[PDB]
């Protein structure tokens, strides 16, 4: 999938 586990959801594709 395209979601990336950055600390925040802004511009994470989640």
């Amino acid at each position: 999938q395209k979601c990336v586990f950055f600390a925040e959801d802004v511009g994470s594709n989640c």
């Epitope: 999938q1 395209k2 979601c3 990336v4 586990f5 950055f6 600390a7 925040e8 802004v10 511009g11």
Partner: antibody, heavy 119, light 114 residues
């Protein structure tokens, strides 16, 4: 084992097309983001941006917005970065790297391509 | 863009000695909800690609010897080695994995004292 195969060295003429290749193997090409990372002579690392090979979506570093074009060839599971208007300033080692699954750090790296810009 | 500062940029060491390398960031890397810090450490040796040591500030990548230890919180982080070995003579740099664009420190080079 995950493999990211990059050429050792590319010489690119000013105002010409730097198309750098990163051949992926040992994993599902279409599932994970592939980043490009810049290392100028002993200067520390710059994240250029990344591309998802499922559809070719590209998120760039703002610094490389007008400089880097990222693409993908699913049939040769290969990632390409293209540098527009390259100068001696862009002479560096360029790595491709894989996220550790969905986590934004780099478990797998290519050996890097030493790019020399010169006429 | 989050800015990563590693000072100093070289340390001179005897083998067997404990070394602590510092990494500061311009913004806190702590996530309040899970109480986890979003910093990675890497080892690089000349003419070689970087190697993952630590993620989430203090989790060792499997295969990484337990003499390597990550610590700290917010804007201040340390990579320690409890007994520096010859093979540990390398460059080490931090990377915030908090928010894009991803950013690295300029590294700290570990050298032998004489």
């Amino acid at each position: 084992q995950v493999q990211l195969q990059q050429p050792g060295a590319e010489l690119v003429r000013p105002g010409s097309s730097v198309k750098l290749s990163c051949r992926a193997s040992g994993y599902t090409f279409t599932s994970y983001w592939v980043s490009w990372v810049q290392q100028r002579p002993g200067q520390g690392l710059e994240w250029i941006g990344m591309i998802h090979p499922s559809d070719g979506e590209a998120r760039l570093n703002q610094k490389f917005k007008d400089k880097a074009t990222l693409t993908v060839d699913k049939s040769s599971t290969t990632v390409y970065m293209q540098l527009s208007s390259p100068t001696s300033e862009d002479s560096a080692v360029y790595y491709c790297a894989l996220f550790d699954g969905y986590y934004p750090w780099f478990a797998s790296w290519g050996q890097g391509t030493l790019v020399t810009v010169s006429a | 863009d989050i800015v990563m500062t590693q000072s100093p940029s070289s340390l001179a060491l005897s083998v067997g000695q404990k070394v602590t390398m510092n990494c500061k960031s311009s913004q806190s890397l702590l996530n309040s909800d899970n109480q986890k810090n979003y910093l990675a450490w890497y080892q690089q040796k000349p003419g070689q690609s970087p190697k993952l040591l630590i993620y989430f500030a203090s989790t060792r990548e499997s295969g990484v010897p337990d003499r390597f230890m990550g610590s700290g919180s917010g804007t201040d982080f340390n990579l320690s080695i409890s007994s520096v070995q010859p093979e540990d003579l390398a460059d080490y740099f931090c990377q915030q994995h908090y928010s894009p664009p991803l950013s690295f420190g300029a590294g700290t080079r570990l050298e032998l004292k004489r």
